[PDB]
Every structure is written in structure tokens, then in C-alpha cells.
């Protein structure tokens, strides 16, 4: 279909604004470091500077919207299961209770620009929920992402 709507650029635009506390228009290594440092990790500035210059053509030292967009929009694979499997579950199970509640999945859903219905909501979670307990456990999630059948 290849729809692609403002909802895509908006999501990225919102995140970008987050990185640029001083909404200057372009993220700087320093600002980027501050955000990364406050991300529960502190990578070496070496790879950070090299990584930034790697994508940034004119390697001006700052990532422009066009660069940020393509940067992420382009890179979208995995290379790390425990990362995607955990990162996703972490988002779904906001409260991190070990189970995905309809309400939690409801937001993570519409929050993406989708108006579901009572019927869809039921089958939405009820389908993944093998125990029909109106909730999905991490175990069920992994299996659902694996076999899927």
C-alpha cells in the first residue's frame, strides 16, 4: 500500500523535539550525549562522534531533521532479539506486571493512529491471549512472535 502519512513524520518529529531540548532544529553531539547519558547508558564519545559523522554527510557535528528521519526510518531491522523482544514487552507492559492488559495494549494501539472497536479490541487481545484470561503473558508473546501459527 505504501501509505505513509504525517503520523510517521509526526512520531519522528515528536521524538526529535525530545532530543533537542533547546529546539534549535539540529541535534548536537553534546545534547545527544546528555540525552544518551540520561538513558541508563554512557557509550564512548569515540563511536558517538564517529557514528554521528558516519551518517551525517557534511558531518557538521549535528543531525538535521532530514538526517534524523532517514537515519531511523532507514535503519529498522533487529540484530538483537532480547532487545526487540524486551523493548516491545517493556512498552506493552508499561506497569511491567508480566502481563499485557487490554488498556495497556489499547493505548499502544490507538496511540499509533488507529480507531478500533469493542469487537476488534476483544479479538485484538483475546486472539493472542491463549489462556483467554483477557491478558497476554510474556511467554505467550514470545511464542506468538516465533511460530505465530
Amino acid at each position: 500500500a505504501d501509505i505513509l502519512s504525517e503520523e510517521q513524520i509526526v512520531d519522528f518529529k515528536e521524538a526529535f523535539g525530545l532530543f533537542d531540548k533547546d529546539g534549535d532544529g539540529c541535534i548536537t553531539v553534546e545534547e545527544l550525549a546528555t540525552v544518551i547519558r540520561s538513558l541508563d547508558q554512557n557509550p564512548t564519545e569515540e563511536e558517538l562522534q564517529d557514528m554521528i559523522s558516519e551518517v551525517d554527510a557534511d558531518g557538521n557535528g549535528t543531525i538535521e531533521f532530514d538526517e534524523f528521519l532517514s537515519l531511523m526510518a532507514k535503519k529498522v531491522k533487529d540484530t538483537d532479539a532480547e532487545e526487540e523482544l524486551k523493548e516491545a514487552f517493556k512498552v506493552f507492559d508499561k506497569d511491567q506486571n508480566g502481563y499485557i492488559s487490554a488498556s495497556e495494549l489499547r493505548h499502544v494501539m490507538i496511540n499509533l493512529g488507529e480507531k478500533l472497536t469493542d469487537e476488534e479490541v476483544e479479538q485484538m487481545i483475546k486472539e493472542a491471549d491463549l489462556d483467554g484470561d483477557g491478558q497476554v503473558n510474556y511467554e505467550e508473546f514470545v511464542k506468538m512472535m516465533m511460530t505465530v501459527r
Binding site: 547508558q41 557514528m51 523493548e87 499509533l112 476488534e120 485484538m124
Partner: peptide, 25 residues
């Protein structure tokens, strides 16, 4: 409903509010 389920995960990957790419590096 397996489609929407994957869509939610796929969309989340695109959104990456944590920056899987940058966060990883």
C-alpha cells in the same frame, strides 16, 4: 488479529521512543 499485533510491534520499532539504533550505539 495477528496482523495488527505485528503492526503494533512493527510500528513501535519505527517509532522507537527509546532509539533502539542510537540507544544500542
Amino acid at each position: 488479529a495477528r496482523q495488527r499485533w505485528r503492526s503494533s510491534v512493527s510500528i513501535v520499532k519505527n517509532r522507537a521512543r527509546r532509539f533502539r539504533m542510537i540507544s544500542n550505539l
